[PDB]
Amino acid sequence: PVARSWVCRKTYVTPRRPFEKSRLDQELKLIGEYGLRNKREVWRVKFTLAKIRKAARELLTLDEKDPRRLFEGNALLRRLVRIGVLDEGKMKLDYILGLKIEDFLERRLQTQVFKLGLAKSIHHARVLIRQRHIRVRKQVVNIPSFIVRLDSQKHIDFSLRSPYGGGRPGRVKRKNAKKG
Amino acid sequence: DTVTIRTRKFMTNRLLQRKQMVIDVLHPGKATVPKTEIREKLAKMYKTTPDVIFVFGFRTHFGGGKTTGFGMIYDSLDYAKKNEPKHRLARHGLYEKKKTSRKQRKERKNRMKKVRGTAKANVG
Amino acid sequence: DTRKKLSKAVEKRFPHDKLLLLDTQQEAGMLLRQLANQKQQHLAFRDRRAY
Amino acid sequence: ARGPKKHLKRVAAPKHWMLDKLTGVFAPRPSTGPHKLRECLPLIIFLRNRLKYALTGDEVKKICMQRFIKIDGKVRTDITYPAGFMDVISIDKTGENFRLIYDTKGRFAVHRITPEEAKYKLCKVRKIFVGTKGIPHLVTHDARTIRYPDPLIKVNDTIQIDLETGKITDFIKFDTGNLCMVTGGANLGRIGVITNRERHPGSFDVVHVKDANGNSFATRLSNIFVIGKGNKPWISLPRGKGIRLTIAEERDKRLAAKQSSG
RNA sequence: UACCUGGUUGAUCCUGCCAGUAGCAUAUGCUUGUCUCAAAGAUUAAGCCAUGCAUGUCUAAGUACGCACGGCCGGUACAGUGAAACUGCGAAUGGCUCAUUAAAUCAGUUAUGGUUCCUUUGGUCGCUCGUACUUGGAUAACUGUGGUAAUUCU
RNA sequence: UGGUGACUCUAGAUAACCUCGGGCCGAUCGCACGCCGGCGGCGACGACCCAUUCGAACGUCUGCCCUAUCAACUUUCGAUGGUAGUCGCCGUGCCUACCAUGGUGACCACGGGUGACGGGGAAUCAGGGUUCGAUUCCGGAGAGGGAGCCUGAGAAACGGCUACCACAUCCAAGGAAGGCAGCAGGCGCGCAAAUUACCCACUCCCGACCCGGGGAGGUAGUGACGAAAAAUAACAAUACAGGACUCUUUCGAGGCCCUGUAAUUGGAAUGAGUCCACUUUAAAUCCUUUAACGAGGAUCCAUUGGAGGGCAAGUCUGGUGCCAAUUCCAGCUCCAAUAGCGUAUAUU
RNA sequence: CUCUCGGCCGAAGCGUUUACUUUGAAAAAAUU
Structure with missing residues (x-):
């Protein structure tokens, strides 16, 4: 007996057929578009989408006024809207079955740092977050895959402690400036 | 200066003769503020002496702006000497513990239970 | 962590071997005990011959 | 086992205690006393995990050994003493009184009462x-x-x-048209009015109760506690008045409180 | 995501098994920068074990003439701290393993109107018509003499 | 009297009994002292009985894998039932005496096997299923194998005792002591599994107890079992190469853009490391926070496998033998996943 | 679906008995 929990989950699925050209090319498309480190981030987002689709299908097998359908559909729709993947005017479960991996890829912190003009590229965005220059609200966030909510979209900025931000010069610049 | 103290979840615990709260410390570009400095800051905040103030369990957040810990102010030094743990009372120099290991005490105990009578006090 | 590196430095030639520490008399007794009770590698050449 | 068991594992503790998984291997294990083990609140869980007067069990013992705690008017110094339904906990140093009565979710409310109500x-x-x-x-x-x-x-x-x-x-007699609180089973904590009692000889009787909104629920007769005469309770009730809201209405009241306060 | 690729014929379709593939366990090889959690002598041998530790315990409130310490006030039995020892309680919990065990164990359901129960909590505790302003003998710790190679022996 | 669905229940009355190995009816201890020798307030400990609590133990109903190369079994020696008793905490062939001849079985008894402790549960998952569950929760069982007791409320107890069987320790040879399927650790076995560390601070348990103790438990150590996040570069100019758009029928021009590729230049940003201080904690460590140093081949250098018969991936090179074809060896190039990736075996 | 006694109802026999379906009570946590 120990005061430990052993509850833990794999968060991705390896595909059944390893070598098919269309899936490889589409994965490479997404990796290049979004600056992902490897195929496993594609598999991770694909997994969360598959989970959400299974939940929506099992809710849709229920009859229309079933209270579990109303409660759990409202919760699922509210969460998908809250991370900005579904529009607010599309609170219908069937629209969940229309989504794509690219939406949850657009809601990453890497992509939102790229689209807000703090970075010159998507790879510059991953590097910018990973090196403690990006802060959401007033919290330094180091994780590229941090999914940004709609109330947190207008609050992504530069760390008040970063050289590009508040302004203490970095290690290289302070080394070079003291040579002369 | 730039280190500010706020107290969040204040409670006047009249059963353990103290006031206990969560202490939130802001130090935007420094390290984690030492516990003694927080103790004079709480002594200035609550209009008292800092030898009855005990703070513990501070964790700095990721990013460095903020550190949360717990603190409690005792009415007197006597209630502090009664109701505080011995180790927190030792961190302030008010208690000194015995310098013997478990192996030494346990072997002494098992050795002196092979002896009957007041010769028990002669076993090392 | 010194010992950590040491184990790795050893593992290119001694792959699965325990690094005893010989600093004190108590550790010397532990090593002597480990040496007395341990399975013996038998070398065929000297075992077929009286030496 | 060869005799009585003295320990309680934390994951085998009663769920309505609301103990978390990773604090320890053991749960406080109530002593023998006036209430059953599965239907009690030990004094340490009340005075530490509910009221937060103490942060560890050691200072729960420090609060108890100063004789500041009373259950039903008597100084109880044991920290795992089983207090149960309708018990009146008196802490006269802080001048507080509590009654141990259930939530609508089947957990022991922190229910503060008047010193006049502490008498009975x-x-x-x-x-x-x-x-x-x-x-x-x-x-x-x-x-x-x-x-x-x-x-x-x-x-x-x-x-x-x-x-x-x-x-x-x-x-108060057990009658129909008469007010009860449920003390066991799936309907525990709900408060309503007795409407029926279908007698089963050699088996358990079943009592039908109607809620103040019109909801009807049945229990075993052992799960009924008459708390008032007719329609008015003889004690103070907690915030929820024994009306079990559905999860949709819980969500709606939570969002309405967020919108109104905030 | 209710998914495929190949293998017998000169060539075609079939049956039919297999190979690839994917997951889960054990092991193992090569490699390994950071950080969070985290299983871990089950499988074979319920095989065999050196050494150490794993179970003890005192409040104002059972027994203090150990100066082992320690103030009175002096006829005041006993200030107080208190090792030892007697007495009481615990040691039937916890921890380990899976050998046994096949309507046995075990789960759900029922019963004790067929039983016991330390303890906690409540009740009962002048309900008996018949030396007490206090009863008796011991035995430890302690002092002293010892036996045996050897024991938590005496 | 009172109760239950049902008492031979509870309560009542009478005649008595009441075990010396004996049933209650207080020769106990502390703290404050006060009233009219007598009256006393809080407690502590004991205690017959009844209730309660924590159980425990016997029963009820339903539910388990493989085997007929196990078809009849139990019954003298209790197998099924009856009466009376014994014993037990109690109901009962539990045991005894005498009777009755019963009881179970192809709806699979009885016997044997299981790489069988049982459940909660795990993997797969359209669904039905198939496979797994020694293992932290619940229930059982055992302490080398059997057997029998003592104390106690509770044990057929093994960190209790007494024997025998198998092992084994010390000895002055007369004697004495034993039981890691507890925590470490060792030998053996094997394909196969960590430190003879620190602490009662946490969780809780026990005791006369706020105070002592706890290899339970917590903490570090070993740990690529497994699961989570996640570095190994980014940008600008320059030079070529594409692709758009303006002007030209086109060639062409675009200080017109955009996108790639560099034995090309450039300083900006930083961790990995090294190392003060806090913080952490029982004391530490780690993490988190922060000084200082810390990057150009940023040598601070990513591996593991597979490809020239099909899923992803070759019209390649050099040695070596055999009669241009052709056994063995070392490479290049490409593809896949990536701090991970092959293999064996089992299983789905 | 009814026959009696007590306040249009409550008790009683149920109506051949089942298999089936539904409801209600009750049914550890952890895991999912």
């Missing part, structure tokens, strides 16, 4: 029997025996009893 308690009578020299005795739900009860008091009635004297002050 309601006990469900659990058996009546005649002892030597023809003396009627009454055994309640928390192991009280009262000599010479009123002859009108039968089993399953509720007696209002005075904590200082230990003598019966009043009683």
Whole structure:
């Protein structure tokens, strides 16, 4: 007996057929578009989408006024809207079955740092977050895959402690400036 | 200066003769503020002496702006000497513990239970 | 962590071997005990011959 | 086992205690006493995990050993003493009084009461029997025996009893149209009015209760505690008045409170 | 995501098994920068074990003439701290393993109107018509003499 | 009297009994002292009985894998039932005496096997299923194998005792002591599994107890079992190469853009490391926070496998033998996943 | 679906008995 929990989950699925050209090319498309480190981030987002689709299908097998359908559909729709993947005017479960991996890829912190003009590229965005220059609200966030909510979209900025931000010069610049 | 103290979840615990709260410390570009400095800051905040103030369990957040810990102010030094743990009372120099290991005490105990009578006090 | 590196430095030639520490008399007794009770590698050449 | 078990694992503790998984291997293990193990709140869980006067069990012992805690008017120094339904906890140093009555979700409310309401308690009578020299005795739900009860008091009635004297002050019969709180099963904590009692000989009777909104629910007769006469309760009720809201209405009231306050 | 690729014929379709593939366990090889959690002598041998530790315990409230310490006030039995020892309680919990065990164990359901129960909590505790302003003998710790190679022996 | 669904229940009355190996009816201890020798307030400990609590133990109903190369079994020696008793905490062939001849079985008894402790549960998952569950929760069982007791409320107890069987320790040879399927650790076995560390601070348990103790438990150590996040570069100019758009029928021009590729230049940003201080904690460590140093081949250098018969991936090179074809060896190039990736075996 | 006694109803026999379906009570946590 120990005061430990052993509850833990794999968060991705390896595909059944390893070598098919269309899936490889589409994965490479997404990796290049979004600056992902490897195929496993594609598999991770694909997994969360598959989970959400299974939940929506099992809710849709229920009859229309079933209270579990109303409660759990409202919760699922509210969460998908809250991370900005579904529009607010599309609170219908069937629209969940229309989504794509690219939406949850657009809601990453890497992509939102790229689209807000703090970075010159998507790879510059991953590097910018990973090196403690990006802060959401007033919290330094180091994780590229941090999914940004709609109330947190207008609050992504530069760390008040970063050289590009508040302004203490970095290690290289302070080394070079003291040579002369 | 730039280190500010706020107290969040204040409670006047009249059963353990103290006031206990969560202490939130802001130090935007420094390290984690030492516990003694927080103790004079709480002594200035609550209009008292800092030898009855005990703070513990501070964790700095990721990013460095903020550190949360717990603190409690005792009415007197006597209630502090009664109701505080011995180790927190030792961190302030008010208690000194015995310098013997478990192996030494346990072997002494098992050795002196092979002896009957007041010769028990002669076993090392 | 010194010992950590040491184990790795050893593992290119001694792959699965325990690094005893010989600093004190108590550790010397532990090593002597480990040496007395341990399975013996038998070398065929000297075992077929009286030496 | 070769004799009584003395320990309680944390994951085997009662769920309504609301203990978390990673604090320890063990749960506080109530002592034997006036309430069952699965239907009690030990004093350490109340005074540490609910009221937060103490942060560890050691200073729970420090609060207890100063004789600041009373259950039903008596100083209880044991930190795992089993307190249960309708118990009146008095802490006169802080000047606070509590009654241990259930939430609508089946957990022991932190329910603060008036010092005037701390004087009495309601006990469900659990058996009546005649002892030597023809003396009627009454055994309640928390192991009280009262000599010479009123002859009108039968089993399953509720007696209002005075904590200082230990003598019966009043009683309520088990009738229809009469107010009860559920003390077990899936409907635990709900408060309503008895409408029916379908008797099953050699088996358990089932009592039908109607909520203040019109919701109807049944329980076993052992799960019924009469708490008022007709429609008005004889004690203070907690915030939720025994009306179990559905999860949709819980979500709606939570969002309405967020929108109104914030 | 209710998914495929190949293998017998000169060539075609079939049956039919297999190979690839994917997951889960054990092991193992090569490699390994950071950080969070985290299983871990079950499988074979319920095989065999050196050494150490794993179970003890005192409040104002059972027994203090150990100066082992320690103030009175002096006829005041006993200030107070208190090792030892007697007495009481615990050692039937916890921890380990899976050998046994196949309507046995075990789960759900019921019963004790067929039983016991330390303890906690409540009741009962002048309900008996018949030296007490206090009863008796011991035995430890302690002092002293010892036996045996050897024991938590005496 | 009172109760139950049902008492031979509870309570009542009478005649008595009441075990010396004996049933209650207080020769106990502390703290404050006060009233009219007598009256006393809080407690502590004991205690017959009844209730309660924690159980425990016997029963009820339903539910388990493989085997007929196990078809009849139990019954003298209790197998099924009856009466009376014994014993037990109690109901009962539990045991005894005498009777009755019963009881179970192809709806699979009885016997044997299981790489069988049982459940909660795990993997797969359209669904039905198939496979797994020694293992932290619940229930059982055992302490080398059997057997029998003592104390106690509770044990057929093994960190209790007494024997025998198998092992084994010390000895002055007369004697004495034993039981890691507890925590470490060792030997053996094997394909196969960590430190003879620190602490009662946490969780809780026990005791006369706020105070002592706890290899339970917590903490570090070993740990690529497994699961989570996640570095190994980014940008600008320059030079070529594409692709758009303006002007030209086109060639062409675009200080017109955009996108790639560099034995090309450039300083900006930083961790990995090294190392003060806090913080952490029982004391530490780690993490988190922060000084200082810390990057150009940023040598601070990513591996593991597979490809020239099909899923992803070759019209390649050099040695070596055999009669241009052709056994063995070392490479290049490409593809896949990536701090991970092959293999064996089992299983789905 | 009814026959009696007590306040249009409550008790009683149920109506051949089942298999089936539904409801209600009750049914550890952890895991999912």
